[PDB]
Amino acid sequence: LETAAKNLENQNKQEYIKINEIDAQGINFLATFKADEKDNLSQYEEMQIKRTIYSSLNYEKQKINTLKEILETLYNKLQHRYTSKEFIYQIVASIQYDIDRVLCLIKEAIIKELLMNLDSSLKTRQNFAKKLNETIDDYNKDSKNIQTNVDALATYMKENYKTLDSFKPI
Amino acid sequence: SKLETAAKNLENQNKQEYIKINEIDAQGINFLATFKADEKDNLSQYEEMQIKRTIYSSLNYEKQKINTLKEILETLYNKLQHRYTSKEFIYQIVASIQYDIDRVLCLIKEAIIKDNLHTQNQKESELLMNLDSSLKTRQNFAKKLNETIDDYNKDSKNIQTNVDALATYMKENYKTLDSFKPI
């Protein structure tokens, strides 16, 4: 348990320094979301999202940029705006948060079913990553017209990121 | 959102704490050596860091005051008679002040995320009160801790010169974790 905390902690710092490296080159990934005055993308929330995304896409700028275009392209159509937001604030944040929650519960133990809870929530982020990479690949091949047609992109994203629980292990 | 801009001030202050601690530690000052070396209680490097979080903050990152504390806890540790007072301070008082604060930030964060889901059950004022509370505890602690570095260096009530005085004093001044909370 101490060893999990130790490893996971070390993973968190490594992600943090990698995210900062990428963002220093001025790729404002969630720029369009930061600019939104309806919700408030807190600095903290911005950061949690990136942990999942950046890690998922193995810190490859080109890929982060490709996804930026999908989120932005749905964002630029009022009809599908909720789809881009729900992805970020509902799926991606929930995948990330869950990992975090267990690590509080692991810390709370060390200082007073957790290892299968930690197992699960890390695994849920592995299955998301895999799905996301397929999606980046699918986009660049304009499969199901999800590059030329934003209606298709909406359908595809809706269908492929329906619920948090679908990325969980069986 | 006050809750969001609470998460932000703890986040960056957490970070700023981390870079100072690692710097002070870099210079070979072995604050928790004696406690790490202990078989009976495994002290994790997280556990250790969190403890430093409350102590090095409270002593304003001044090495002198840290090694004077080091001198106190090791004096207490090496007199078998009084060795558990050294740990209660470390593990039952220090590690309890720090832990309340990180627990609130876990909860503050949950509430922020759950807001975006539309499933926020946590009352937003309760978390801020709890935040404002545990911060104040650690400052009440910090104030006590500098009193105790001053006294030791002046040998007040024979605290430097008699370990039985020192054990009494630390028990008097660091009795319960609630003894530093506001009212």
Author numbering:
A (entry chain G): 14 to 125, 137 to 194
B (entry chain A): 12 to 194
Please give sentences taken from the publication describing this entry.
Two CspA orthologous proteins, BGA71 and BGA66, that are capable of binding complement system components C7, C8, and C9 and thus inhibiting the assembly of the MAC have been identified in B. bavariensis, allowing B. bavariensis to escape the attack by the immune system. The importance of BGA71 and BGA66 in the resistance to the immune system was supported by the gain of resistance to complement-mediated killing after expression of either protein in the serum-sensitive B. garinii strain G132. In conclusion, we have solved the crystal structure of the key complement inhibitory protein BGA71 from B. bavariensis. The overall fold of the BGA71 protein looks similar (Cα root-mean-square deviation from 1.66 Ǻ to 2.63 Ǻ) to the previously released crystal structures of the orthologous PFam54 proteins CspA, BBA64, BBA66, and BBA73 of B. burgdorferi.
All three BGA71 constructs were overexpressed in E. coli, but only BGA7162-251 yielded crystals, suggesting that the flexible region present in the other two constructs interfered with the crystal formation, as previously observed for the BBA66 protein of B. burgdorferi. The diffracting crystals of the Se-Met BGA7162-251 construct belonged to the space group P31 and contained 18 molecules per asymmetric unit with a water content of approximately 45%. The final model of BGA7162-251 was generated for residues 69–251 since the first four residues that remained after cleavage of the His-tag and residues 66–68 were not built due to weak electron density. By surveying the crystal structure of BGA71, we identified cysteine 173 in α-helix D as the residue that forms disulfide bridges, which is responsible for cross-linking of the two monomers. Furthermore, comparative sequence analysis of the PFam54 orthologous proteins reveals that cysteine 173 is not present in any other orthologous PFam54 protein, suggesting that dimerization by cysteine cross-linking is a unique feature of BGA71. The structure of CspA showed the highest similarity to BGA71 among the other PFam54 orthologs of B. burgdorferi, with a Cα root-mean-square deviation of 1.66 Ǻ. However, the proposed N-terminal residues 37–63 involved in the binding of C7 and C9 are not visible in the crystal structure of BGA71 since they form a flexible loop region connecting the protein structural domain to the cell surface.
